Amino acid sequence: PLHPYWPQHLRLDNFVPNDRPTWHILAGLFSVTGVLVVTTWLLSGRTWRRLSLCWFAVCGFIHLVIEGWFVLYYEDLLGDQAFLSQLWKEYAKGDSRYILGDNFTVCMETITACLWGPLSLWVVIAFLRQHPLRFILQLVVSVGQIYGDVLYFLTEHRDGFQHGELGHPLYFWFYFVFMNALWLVLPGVLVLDAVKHLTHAQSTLD
Amino acid sequence: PLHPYWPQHLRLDNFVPNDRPTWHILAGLFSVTGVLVVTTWLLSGRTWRRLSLCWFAVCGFIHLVIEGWFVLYYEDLLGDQAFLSQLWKEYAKGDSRYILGDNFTVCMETITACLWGPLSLWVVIAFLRQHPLRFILQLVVSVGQIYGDVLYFLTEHRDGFQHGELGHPLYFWFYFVFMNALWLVLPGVLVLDAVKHLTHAQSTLD
Ligand SMILES: CCN(CC)CCO[C@H]1CC[C@@]2(C)C(=CC[C@@H]3[C@@H]2CC[C@]2(C)C(=O)CC[C@@H]32)C1
Ligand SMILES: CCN(CC)CCO[C@H]1CC[C@@]2(C)C(=CC[C@@H]3[C@@H]2CC[C@]2(C)C(=O)CC[C@@H]32)C1
């Protein structure tokens, strides 16, 4: 095959295999995410909700930098761009169609980068002073994430999983199903959390 | 041309124009919506927030009946079905591609039928103080509606408004821009409402 993307009849000109190996991307992401998690842990310290703050920092980073990189630089598809573009080519080696610049993928991603990145960072920043809007922002960001991800799954399901090889453990099960299921489940828990707290605050008013 | 739908290269066999004229559909929906608004006003009696309740009842009605009708019967869309199917063909004469059964559109519509419809009825029920959840549900539903509508507009914009004639007063400006813009403007205002109240309720933390 000329390319690993599973709709193998795709004739992808301007396609260049990336010079940096995947372990480069893994090391870079692990290090940067560790730095963010540690720094946010310290800022929160100076119990679980501090972990949620670290989660929101990671989310803001992913939405703003990575997904923003996708929204800005499709369809470039040349590994001469940073390990962000190399990362996107690897994930597109996974199930989803991040090479074609699909209308929905670009639109959904632009919304999450422009809004949920900034709003997640606002969740963590304004959470450090226990501000009334905090549970509202946590709920809004988690609803937007759950909604975008549900549309993501629904669209690729009705498309018959055309994009990306089916059943594959790494590319389909870990990349497509698991991580996205994280953005389904974890903000779901956060939704339940924020709802319980906002309900308690609302019940007091009499 | 054999059909009025504007991607004029569309070769739509199995297309049958419905025998009922557009005034049939417009009168039917206008009357049923009047019935709903009046009955909901009476139920609220038994100021502005009562109008918001009537709005949410109308929203639940549209999401459940009309958009679920589309979600179930977006495949055949032959006017030999009730004035709902002809209603969808009439709207599809406008910009959007509700005849092709676009992969993205149905998915989005499914969500609004399955979630924002029932949740709107829960909003109107819970507003008579049956639960603190009334404002939370209002915020969740309005955020979801705004997200669906923004994705709708963005997706049709990147497509260059291919679907549906540009500039057309009735089909583009009234159907596509104006009506949908309601689900842009009104729930946005409603979000502000809940925020003002929810922030004040969260202000209770002392
Ligand atoms: C969050 C938005 N959702 C839809 C809502 C789209 C998915 O966003 C992806 C963003 C990149 C990233 C983290 C993904 C999982 C596996 C990672 C991949 C980055 C590159 C990695 C590190 C490798 O070299 C092997 C494992 C790969 C998730
Ligand atoms: C919020 C969801 N958004 C997508 C994000 C889709 C909006 O749902 C559509 C539901 C049918 C309806 C109301 C539409 C505009 C013009 C209406 C049309 C129905 C038939 C009408 C009444 C006529 O006979 C003349 C005016 C026509 C809006």
Author numbering:
A (entry chain B), B (entry chain A): 7 to 52, 60 to 219
From the paper:
However, when we supplemented the medium with either U18666A (an inhibitor of cholesterol biosynthesis and Niemann-Pick C1 protein)23,24 or tamoxifen, growth of the yeast was inhibited. In the density map, the ligand (U18666A or tamoxifen) was determined unambiguously. We also showed that U18666A and tamoxifen bind to EBP in the same manner, implying the binding mode of EBP ligands. The compounds that bind to EBP have a positively-charged amine group, mimicking the carbocationic reaction sterol intermediate.
Here we present two structures of human EBP protein each in complex with a different pharmacologically active compound, revealing its mechanism of action in cholesterol biosynthesis and multidrug recognition. EBP forms a homodimer in the crystal, as reported in previous solution studies, with dimensions of 65 × 30 × 55 Å.
